[PDB]
CSV table of C-alpha atoms and ligand atoms in Angstrom, one decimal:
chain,number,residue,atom,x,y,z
A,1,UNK,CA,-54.4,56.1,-128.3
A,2,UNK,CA,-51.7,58.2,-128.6
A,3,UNK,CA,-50.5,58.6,-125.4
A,4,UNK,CA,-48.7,55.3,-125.5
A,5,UNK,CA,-46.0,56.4,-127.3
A,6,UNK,CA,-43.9,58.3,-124.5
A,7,UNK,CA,-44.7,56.0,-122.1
A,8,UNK,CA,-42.3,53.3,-123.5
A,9,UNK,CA,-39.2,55.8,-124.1
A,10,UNK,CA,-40.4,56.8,-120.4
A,11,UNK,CA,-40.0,53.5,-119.4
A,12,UNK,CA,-36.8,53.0,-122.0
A,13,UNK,CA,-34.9,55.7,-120.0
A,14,UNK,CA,-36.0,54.0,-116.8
A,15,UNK,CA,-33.5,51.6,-118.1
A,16,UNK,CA,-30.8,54.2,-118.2
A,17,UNK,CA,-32.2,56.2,-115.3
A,18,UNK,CA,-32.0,52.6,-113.1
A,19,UNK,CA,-28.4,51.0,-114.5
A,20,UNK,CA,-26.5,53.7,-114.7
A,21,UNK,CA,-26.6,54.8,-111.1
A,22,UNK,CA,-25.6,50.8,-111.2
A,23,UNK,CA,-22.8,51.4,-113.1
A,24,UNK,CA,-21.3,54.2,-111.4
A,25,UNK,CA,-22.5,52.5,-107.7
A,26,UNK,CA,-20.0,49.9,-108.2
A,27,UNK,CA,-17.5,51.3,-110.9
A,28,UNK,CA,-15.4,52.7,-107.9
A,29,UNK,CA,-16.2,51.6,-104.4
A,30,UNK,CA,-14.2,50.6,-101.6
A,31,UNK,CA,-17.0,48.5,-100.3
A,32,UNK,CA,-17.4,46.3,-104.1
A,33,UNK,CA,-15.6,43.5,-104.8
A,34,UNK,CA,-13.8,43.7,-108.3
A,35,UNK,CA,-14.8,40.3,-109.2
A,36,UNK,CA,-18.6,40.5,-108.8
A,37,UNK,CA,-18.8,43.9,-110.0
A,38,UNK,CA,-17.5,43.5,-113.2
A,39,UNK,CA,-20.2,41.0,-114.4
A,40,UNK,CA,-23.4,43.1,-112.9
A,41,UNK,CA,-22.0,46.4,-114.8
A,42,UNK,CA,-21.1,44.4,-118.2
A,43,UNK,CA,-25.3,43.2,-117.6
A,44,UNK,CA,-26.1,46.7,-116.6
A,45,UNK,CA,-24.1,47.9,-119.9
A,46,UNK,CA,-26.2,45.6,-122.0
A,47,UNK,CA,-29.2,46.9,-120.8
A,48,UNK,CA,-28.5,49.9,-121.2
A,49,UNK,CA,-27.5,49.7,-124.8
A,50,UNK,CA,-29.9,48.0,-125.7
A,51,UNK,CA,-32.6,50.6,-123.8
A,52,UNK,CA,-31.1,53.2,-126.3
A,53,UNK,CA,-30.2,51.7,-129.4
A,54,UNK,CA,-33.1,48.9,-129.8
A,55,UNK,CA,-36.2,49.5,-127.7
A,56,UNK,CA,-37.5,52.8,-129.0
A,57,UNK,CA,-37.6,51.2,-132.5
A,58,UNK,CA,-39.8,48.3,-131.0
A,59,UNK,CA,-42.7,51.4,-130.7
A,60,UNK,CA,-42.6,53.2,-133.8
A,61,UNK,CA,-41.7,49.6,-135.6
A,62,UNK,CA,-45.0,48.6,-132.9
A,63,UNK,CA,-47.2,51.6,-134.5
A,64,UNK,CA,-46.4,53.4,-137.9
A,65,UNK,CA,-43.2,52.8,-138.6
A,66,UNK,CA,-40.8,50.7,-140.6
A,67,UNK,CA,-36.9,51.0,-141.1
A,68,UNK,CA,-36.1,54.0,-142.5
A,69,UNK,CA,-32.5,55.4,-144.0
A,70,UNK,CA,-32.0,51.7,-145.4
A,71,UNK,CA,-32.8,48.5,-144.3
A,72,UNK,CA,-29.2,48.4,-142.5
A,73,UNK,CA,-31.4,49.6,-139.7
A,74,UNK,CA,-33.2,46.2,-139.9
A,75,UNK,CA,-30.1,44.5,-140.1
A,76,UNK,CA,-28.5,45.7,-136.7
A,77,UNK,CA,-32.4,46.1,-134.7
A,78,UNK,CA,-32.7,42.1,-135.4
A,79,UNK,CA,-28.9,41.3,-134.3
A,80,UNK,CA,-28.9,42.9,-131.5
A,81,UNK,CA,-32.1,42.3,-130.3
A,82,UNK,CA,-30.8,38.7,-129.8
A,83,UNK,CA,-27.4,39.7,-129.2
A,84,UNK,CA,-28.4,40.9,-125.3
A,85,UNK,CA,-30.6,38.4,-124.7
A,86,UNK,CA,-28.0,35.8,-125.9
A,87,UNK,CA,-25.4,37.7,-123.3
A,88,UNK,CA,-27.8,38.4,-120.6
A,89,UNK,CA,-28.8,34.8,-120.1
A,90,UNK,CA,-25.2,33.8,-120.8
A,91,UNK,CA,-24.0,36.3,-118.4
A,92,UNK,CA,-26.6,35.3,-115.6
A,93,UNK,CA,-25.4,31.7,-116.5
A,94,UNK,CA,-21.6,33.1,-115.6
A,95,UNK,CA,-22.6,34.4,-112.2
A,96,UNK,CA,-24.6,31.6,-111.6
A,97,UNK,CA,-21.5,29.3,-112.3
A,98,UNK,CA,-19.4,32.2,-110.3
A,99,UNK,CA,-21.8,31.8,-107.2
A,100,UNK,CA,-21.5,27.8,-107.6
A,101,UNK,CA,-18.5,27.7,-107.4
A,102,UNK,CA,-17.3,29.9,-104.9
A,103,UNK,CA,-19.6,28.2,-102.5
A,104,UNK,CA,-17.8,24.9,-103.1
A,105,UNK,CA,-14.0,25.2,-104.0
A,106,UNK,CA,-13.6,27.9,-101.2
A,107,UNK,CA,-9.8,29.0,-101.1
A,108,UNK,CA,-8.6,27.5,-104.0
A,109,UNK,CA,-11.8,29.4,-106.4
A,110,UNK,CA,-10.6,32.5,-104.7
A,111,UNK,CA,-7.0,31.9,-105.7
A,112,UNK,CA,-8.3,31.7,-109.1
A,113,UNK,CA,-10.9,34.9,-109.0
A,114,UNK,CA,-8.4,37.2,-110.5
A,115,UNK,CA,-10.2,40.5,-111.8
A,116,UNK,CA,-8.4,39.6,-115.2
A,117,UNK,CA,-10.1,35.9,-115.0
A,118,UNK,CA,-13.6,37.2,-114.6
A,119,UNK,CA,-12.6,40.0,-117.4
A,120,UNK,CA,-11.9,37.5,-120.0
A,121,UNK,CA,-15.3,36.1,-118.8
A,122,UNK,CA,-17.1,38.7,-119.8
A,123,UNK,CA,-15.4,39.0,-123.2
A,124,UNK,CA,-16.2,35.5,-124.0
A,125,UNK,CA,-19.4,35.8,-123.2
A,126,UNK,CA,-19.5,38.8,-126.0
A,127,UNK,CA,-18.0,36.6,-128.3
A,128,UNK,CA,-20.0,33.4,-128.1
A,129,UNK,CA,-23.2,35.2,-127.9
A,130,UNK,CA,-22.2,36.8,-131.3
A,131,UNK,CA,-22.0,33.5,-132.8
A,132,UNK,CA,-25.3,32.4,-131.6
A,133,UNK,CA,-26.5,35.8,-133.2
A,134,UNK,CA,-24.7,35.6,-136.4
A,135,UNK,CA,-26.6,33.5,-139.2
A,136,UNK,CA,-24.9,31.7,-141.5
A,137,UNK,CA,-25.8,32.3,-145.1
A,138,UNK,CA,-29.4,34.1,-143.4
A,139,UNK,CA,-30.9,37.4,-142.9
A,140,UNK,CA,-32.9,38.4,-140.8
A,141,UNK,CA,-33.1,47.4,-151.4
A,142,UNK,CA,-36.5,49.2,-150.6
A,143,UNK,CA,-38.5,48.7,-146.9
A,144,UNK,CA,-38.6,45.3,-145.8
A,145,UNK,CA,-41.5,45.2,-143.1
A,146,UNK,CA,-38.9,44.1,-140.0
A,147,UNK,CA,-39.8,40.7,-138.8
A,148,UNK,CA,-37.8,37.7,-138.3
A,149,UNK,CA,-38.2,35.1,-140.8
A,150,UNK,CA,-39.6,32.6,-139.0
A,151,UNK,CA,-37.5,29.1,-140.2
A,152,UNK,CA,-38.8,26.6,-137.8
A,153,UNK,CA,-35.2,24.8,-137.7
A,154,UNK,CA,-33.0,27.9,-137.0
A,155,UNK,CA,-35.7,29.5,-135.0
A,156,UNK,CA,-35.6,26.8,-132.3
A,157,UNK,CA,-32.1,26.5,-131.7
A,158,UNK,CA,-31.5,30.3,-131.7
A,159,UNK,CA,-34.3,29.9,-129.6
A,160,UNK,CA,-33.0,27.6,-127.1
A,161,UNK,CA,-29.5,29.4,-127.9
A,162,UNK,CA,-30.5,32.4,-126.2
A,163,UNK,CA,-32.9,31.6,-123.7
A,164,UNK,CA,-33.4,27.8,-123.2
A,165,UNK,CA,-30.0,26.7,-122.8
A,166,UNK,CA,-28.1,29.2,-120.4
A,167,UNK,CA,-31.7,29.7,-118.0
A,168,UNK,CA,-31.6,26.1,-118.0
A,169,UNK,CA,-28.3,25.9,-116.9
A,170,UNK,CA,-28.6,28.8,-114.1
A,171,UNK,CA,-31.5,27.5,-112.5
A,172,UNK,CA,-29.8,24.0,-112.6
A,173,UNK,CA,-26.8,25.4,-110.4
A,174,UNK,CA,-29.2,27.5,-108.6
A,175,UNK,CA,-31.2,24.5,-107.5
A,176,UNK,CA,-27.9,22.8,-106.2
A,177,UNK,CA,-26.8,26.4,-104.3
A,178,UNK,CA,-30.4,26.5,-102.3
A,179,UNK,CA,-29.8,22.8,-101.4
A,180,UNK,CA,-26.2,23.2,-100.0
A,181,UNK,CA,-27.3,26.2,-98.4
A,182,UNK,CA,-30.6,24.4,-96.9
A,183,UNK,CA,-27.9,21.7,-95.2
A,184,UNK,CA,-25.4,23.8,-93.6
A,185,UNK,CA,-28.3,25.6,-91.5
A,186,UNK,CA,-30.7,22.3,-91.0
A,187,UNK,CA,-29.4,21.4,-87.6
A,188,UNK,CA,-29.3,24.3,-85.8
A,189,UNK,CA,-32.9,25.5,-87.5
A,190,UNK,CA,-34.1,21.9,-85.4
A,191,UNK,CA,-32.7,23.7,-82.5
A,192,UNK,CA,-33.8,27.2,-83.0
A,193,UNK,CA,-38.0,26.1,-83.5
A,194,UNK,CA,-37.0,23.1,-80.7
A,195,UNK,CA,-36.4,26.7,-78.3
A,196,UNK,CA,-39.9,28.9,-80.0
A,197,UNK,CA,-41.9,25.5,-79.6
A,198,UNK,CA,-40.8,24.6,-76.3
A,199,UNK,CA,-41.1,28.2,-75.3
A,200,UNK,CA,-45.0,28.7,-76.8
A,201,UNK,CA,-45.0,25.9,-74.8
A,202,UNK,CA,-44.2,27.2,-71.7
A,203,UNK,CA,-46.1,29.9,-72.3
A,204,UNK,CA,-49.3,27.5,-73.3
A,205,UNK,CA,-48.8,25.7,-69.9
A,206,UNK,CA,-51.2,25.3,-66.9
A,207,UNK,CA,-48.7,23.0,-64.6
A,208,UNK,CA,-45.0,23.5,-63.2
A,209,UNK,CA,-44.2,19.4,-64.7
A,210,UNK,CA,-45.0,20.8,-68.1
A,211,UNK,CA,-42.7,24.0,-68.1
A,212,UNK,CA,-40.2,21.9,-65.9
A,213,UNK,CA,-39.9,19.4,-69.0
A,214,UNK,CA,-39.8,22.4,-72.0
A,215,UNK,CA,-36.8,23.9,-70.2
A,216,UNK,CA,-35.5,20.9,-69.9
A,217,UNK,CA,-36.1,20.6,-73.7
A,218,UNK,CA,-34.8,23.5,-74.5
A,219,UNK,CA,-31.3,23.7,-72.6
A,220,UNK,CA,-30.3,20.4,-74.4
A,221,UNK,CA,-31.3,22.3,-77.7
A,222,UNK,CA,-29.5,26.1,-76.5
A,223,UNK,CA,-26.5,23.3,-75.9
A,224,UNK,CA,-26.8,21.6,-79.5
A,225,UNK,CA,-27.3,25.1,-81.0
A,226,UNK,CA,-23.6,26.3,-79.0
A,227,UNK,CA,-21.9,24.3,-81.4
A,228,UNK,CA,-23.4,25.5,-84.9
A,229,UNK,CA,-21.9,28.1,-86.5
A,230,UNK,CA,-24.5,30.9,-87.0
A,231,UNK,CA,-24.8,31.9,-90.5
A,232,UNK,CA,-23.0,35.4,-90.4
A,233,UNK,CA,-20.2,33.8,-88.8
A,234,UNK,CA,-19.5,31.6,-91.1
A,235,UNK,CA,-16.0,31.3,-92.5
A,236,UNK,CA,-14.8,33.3,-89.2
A,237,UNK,CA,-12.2,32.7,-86.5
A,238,UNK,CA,-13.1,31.4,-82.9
A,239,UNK,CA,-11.2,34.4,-82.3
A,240,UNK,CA,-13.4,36.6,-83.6
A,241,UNK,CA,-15.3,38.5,-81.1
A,242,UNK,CA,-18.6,38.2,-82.6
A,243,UNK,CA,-18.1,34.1,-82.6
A,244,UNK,CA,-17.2,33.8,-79.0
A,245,UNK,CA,-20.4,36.8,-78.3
A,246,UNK,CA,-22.2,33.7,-79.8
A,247,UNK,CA,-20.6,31.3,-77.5
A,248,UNK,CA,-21.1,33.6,-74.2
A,249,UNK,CA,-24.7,34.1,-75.4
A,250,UNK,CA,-25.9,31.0,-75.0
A,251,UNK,CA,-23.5,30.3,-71.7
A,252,UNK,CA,-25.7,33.3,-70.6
A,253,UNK,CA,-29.0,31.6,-71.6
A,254,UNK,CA,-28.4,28.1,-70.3
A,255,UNK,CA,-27.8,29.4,-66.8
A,256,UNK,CA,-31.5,31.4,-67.4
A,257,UNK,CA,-32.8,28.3,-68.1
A,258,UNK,CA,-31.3,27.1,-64.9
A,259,UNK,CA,-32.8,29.5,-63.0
A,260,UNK,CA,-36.2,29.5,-64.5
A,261,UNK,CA,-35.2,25.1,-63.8
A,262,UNK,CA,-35.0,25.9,-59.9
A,263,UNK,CA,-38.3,28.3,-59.6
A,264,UNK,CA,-40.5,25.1,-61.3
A,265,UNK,CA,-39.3,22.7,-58.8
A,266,UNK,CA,-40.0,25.6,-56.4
A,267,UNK,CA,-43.6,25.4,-57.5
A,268,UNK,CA,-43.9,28.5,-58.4
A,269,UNK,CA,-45.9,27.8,-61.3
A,270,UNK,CA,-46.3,32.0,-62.3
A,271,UNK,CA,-42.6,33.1,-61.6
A,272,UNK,CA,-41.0,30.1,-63.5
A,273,UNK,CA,-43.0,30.7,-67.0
A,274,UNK,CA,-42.6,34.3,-66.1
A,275,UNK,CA,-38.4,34.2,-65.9
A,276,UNK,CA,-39.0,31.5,-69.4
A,277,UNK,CA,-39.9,35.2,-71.5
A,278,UNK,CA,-36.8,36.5,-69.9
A,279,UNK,CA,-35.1,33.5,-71.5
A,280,UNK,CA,-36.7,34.4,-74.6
A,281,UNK,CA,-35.5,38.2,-75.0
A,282,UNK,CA,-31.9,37.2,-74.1
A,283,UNK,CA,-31.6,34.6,-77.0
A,284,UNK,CA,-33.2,37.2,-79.2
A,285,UNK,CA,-31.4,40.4,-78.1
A,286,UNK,CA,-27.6,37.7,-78.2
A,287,UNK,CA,-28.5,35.5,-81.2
A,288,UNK,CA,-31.0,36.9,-83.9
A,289,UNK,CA,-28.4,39.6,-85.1
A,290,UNK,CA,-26.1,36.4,-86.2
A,291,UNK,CA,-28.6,34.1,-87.3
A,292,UNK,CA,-29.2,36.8,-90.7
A,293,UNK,CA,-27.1,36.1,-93.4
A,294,UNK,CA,-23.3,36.4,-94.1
A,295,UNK,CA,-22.9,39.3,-96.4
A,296,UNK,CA,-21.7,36.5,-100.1
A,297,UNK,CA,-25.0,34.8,-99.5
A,298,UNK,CA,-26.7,38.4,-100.1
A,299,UNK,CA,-25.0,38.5,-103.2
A,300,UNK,CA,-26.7,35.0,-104.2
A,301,UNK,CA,-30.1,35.2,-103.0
A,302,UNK,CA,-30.2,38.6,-104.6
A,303,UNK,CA,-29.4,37.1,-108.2
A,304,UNK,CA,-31.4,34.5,-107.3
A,305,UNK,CA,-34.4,37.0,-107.0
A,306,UNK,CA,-32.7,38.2,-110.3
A,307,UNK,CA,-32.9,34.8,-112.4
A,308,UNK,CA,-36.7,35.4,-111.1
A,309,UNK,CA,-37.5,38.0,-113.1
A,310,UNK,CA,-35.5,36.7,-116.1
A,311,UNK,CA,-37.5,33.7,-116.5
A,312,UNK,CA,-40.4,35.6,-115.5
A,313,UNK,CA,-39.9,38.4,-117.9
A,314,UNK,CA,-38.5,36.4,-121.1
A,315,UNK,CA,-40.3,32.5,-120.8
A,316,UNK,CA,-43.8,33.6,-121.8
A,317,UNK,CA,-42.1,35.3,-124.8
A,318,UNK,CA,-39.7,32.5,-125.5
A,319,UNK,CA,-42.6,29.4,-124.9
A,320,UNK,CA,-44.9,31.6,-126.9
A,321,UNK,CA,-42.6,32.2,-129.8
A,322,UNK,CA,-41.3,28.3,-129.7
A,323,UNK,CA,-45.1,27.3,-130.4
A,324,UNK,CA,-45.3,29.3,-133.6
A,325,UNK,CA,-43.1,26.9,-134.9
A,326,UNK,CA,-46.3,24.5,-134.3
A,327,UNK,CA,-48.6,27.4,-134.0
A,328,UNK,CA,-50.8,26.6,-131.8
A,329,UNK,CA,-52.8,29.7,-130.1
A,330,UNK,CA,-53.3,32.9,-130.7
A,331,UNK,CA,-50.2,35.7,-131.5
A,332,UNK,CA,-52.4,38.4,-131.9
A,333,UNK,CA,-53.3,39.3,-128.4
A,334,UNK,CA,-50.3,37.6,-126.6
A,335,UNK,CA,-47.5,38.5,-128.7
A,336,UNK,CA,-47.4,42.5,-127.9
A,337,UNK,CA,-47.4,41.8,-124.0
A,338,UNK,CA,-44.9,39.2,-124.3
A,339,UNK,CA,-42.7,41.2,-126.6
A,340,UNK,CA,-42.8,44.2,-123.7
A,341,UNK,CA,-42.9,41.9,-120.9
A,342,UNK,CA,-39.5,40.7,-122.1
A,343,UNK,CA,-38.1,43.8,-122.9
A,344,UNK,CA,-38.6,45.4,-119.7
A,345,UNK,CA,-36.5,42.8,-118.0
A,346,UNK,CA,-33.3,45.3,-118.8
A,347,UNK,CA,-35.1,48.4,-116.6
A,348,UNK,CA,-36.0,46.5,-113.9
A,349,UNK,CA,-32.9,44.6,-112.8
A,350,UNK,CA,-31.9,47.5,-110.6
A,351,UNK,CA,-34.9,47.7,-109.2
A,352,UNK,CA,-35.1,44.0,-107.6
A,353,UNK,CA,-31.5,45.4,-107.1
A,354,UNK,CA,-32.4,47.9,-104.3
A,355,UNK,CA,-35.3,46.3,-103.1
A,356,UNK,CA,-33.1,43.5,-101.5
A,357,UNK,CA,-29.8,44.2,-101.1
A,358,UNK,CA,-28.7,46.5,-98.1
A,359,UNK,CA,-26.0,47.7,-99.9
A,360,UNK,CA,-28.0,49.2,-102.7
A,361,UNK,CA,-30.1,51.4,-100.6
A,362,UNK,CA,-27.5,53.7,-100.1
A,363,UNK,CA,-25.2,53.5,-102.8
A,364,UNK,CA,-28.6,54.5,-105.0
A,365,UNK,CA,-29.2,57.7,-102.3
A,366,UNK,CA,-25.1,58.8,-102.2
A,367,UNK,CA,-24.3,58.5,-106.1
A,368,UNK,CA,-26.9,61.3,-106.2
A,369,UNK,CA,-26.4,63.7,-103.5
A,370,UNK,CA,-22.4,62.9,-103.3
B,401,E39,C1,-36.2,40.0,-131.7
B,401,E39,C2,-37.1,39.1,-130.8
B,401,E39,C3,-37.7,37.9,-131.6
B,401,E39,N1,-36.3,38.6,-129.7
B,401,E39,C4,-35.2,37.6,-129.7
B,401,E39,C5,-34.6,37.0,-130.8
B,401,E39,C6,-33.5,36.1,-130.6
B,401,E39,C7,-33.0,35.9,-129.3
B,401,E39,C8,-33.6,36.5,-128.2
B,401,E39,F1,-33.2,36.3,-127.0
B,401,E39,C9,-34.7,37.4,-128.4
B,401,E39,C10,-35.6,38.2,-127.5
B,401,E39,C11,-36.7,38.7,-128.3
B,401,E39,C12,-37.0,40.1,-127.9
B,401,E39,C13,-36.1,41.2,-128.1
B,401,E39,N2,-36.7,42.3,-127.7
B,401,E39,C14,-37.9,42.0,-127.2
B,401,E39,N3,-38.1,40.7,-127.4
């Protein structure tokens, strides 16, 4: 009934309440790149313009209401309704393009990451999603019931110029990004589950031959996985402390394996698979803490939960509101939970935000107490 109504200005300021701290989180930290804050504040910032300026309108426009003061309220709910949509894609599309290619070009990308490259980014971004918003010769005097005029020829492209186009694009990047990233760490993935299989193994063993042979397994594996580089160490010296405490890890494990080698051929069946768990907690208590990720893929994989929600939020509209063009199946029922469904994309950014990154968690509990 109406109870309804606060909830979605509850929810709007969510928006605010959520992307603000975002904005102020990374507007001046020591720990925040320049480069990659920029574009998730200028996303934040369209969010939370649009939470203020556009989305209480949807309600009242929703349930009793229609432009009031002039239909120049009409004007400017429709353009920028499409204008942050337009932008957020297109921006999403930017940082998927950003993480691409940083991944790839490596020194020479970072040579060319000036703050004041990714700034004019952003800007263009503005300005070309204010074309796709701008109708030539089109509109979107007394009350005019606000709707979009539904031309099936500009409604597709705008369509497809807003959504379509630039999540196609990110997820087409994306897509590449999980595959390079899947190769790097192949081989010495083989060589970690080669170690927890042959170690279950061990474990799963009545006779001294069979735990003889899955240590035998395994050092050759502890060997192969030496010569990986683990994935927080990528892009580090040999120098670096934490690449040679991988090195000296497994030096340390491979001489466990040895010893657990000589108390098979020993015979003693119980103290051999017994020293193998030893084996076990070593590698853990050396490797695991290098095996998680190096701190630029966190950055990725969290946008990549992003572009998530953004095709989860905005598709069902979008697909929806492309079939009206045919008009297939019904808009009465679906329409109003895929117009919100959208909408709420803009609140709920920070929220994936913190529920991932490490980072987040206390920038979101220091911006508050200080
Ligand atoms: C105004 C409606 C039709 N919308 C629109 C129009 C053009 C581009 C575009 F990306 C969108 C999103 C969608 C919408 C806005 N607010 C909630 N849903």
């Amino acid at each position: 009934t109406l109870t309804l109504v606060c909830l979605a200005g509850l929810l709007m300021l969510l928006t605010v309440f959520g992307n603000v701290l975002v904005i102020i989180a990374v507007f001046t930290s020591r720990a925040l790149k320049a480069p990659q804050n920029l574009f998730l504040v200028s996303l934040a910032s369209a969010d939370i313009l649009v939470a203020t300026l556009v989305i209480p309108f949807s309600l009242a426009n929703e349930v009793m209401g229609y432009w009031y003061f002039g239909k120049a309220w009409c004007e400017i709910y429709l353009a920028l309704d499409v204008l942050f949509c337009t932008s957020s894609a297109w921006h999403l599309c930017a940082i998927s393009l950003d993480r691409y290619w940083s991944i790839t070009q490596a020194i020479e990308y970072n040579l060319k990451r000036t703050p004041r490259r990714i700034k004019a980014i952003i800007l263009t971004v503005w300005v070309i999603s204010a074309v796709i918003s701008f109708p030539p010769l089109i509109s979107i005097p007394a009350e005019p019931r606000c709707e979009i005029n539904d031309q099936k020829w500009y409604v597709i492209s705008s369509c497809i110029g807003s959504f379509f186009a630039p999540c196609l694009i990110m997820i087409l990047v994306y897509v590449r990004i999980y595959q390079i990233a899947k190769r790097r760490t192949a081989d010495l993935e083989d060589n970690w589950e080669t170690l927890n299989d042959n170690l279950k193994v061990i474990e799963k063993a009545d006779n001294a031959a069979q735990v003889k042979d899955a240590l035998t397994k395994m050092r050759a594996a502890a060997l192969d996985a030496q010569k990986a580089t683990p994935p927080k160490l990528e892009d580090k010296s040999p120098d670096s402390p934490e690449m040679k405490d991988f090195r000296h890890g497994f030096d340390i494990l491979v001489g466990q394996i040895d010893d657990a080698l000589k108390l098979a051929n020993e015979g003693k069946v119980k103290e051999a698979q017994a020293a193998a768990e030893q084996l076990k907690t070593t590698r853990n208590a050396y490797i695991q803490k290098y095996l998680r990720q190096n701190r630029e893929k966190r950055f990725t994989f969290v946008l990549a939960v992003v572009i998530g929600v953004f095709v989860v939020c905005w598709f069902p509209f979008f697909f929806t509101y492309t079939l009206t063009a045919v008009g297939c199946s019904v808009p009465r029922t679906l329409f109003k939970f895929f117009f919100w469904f959208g909408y709420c994309n803009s609140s709920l950014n920070p929220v994936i935000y913190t529920i991932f990154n490490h980072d987040f968690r206390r920038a979101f509990k220091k911006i508050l107490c200080r």
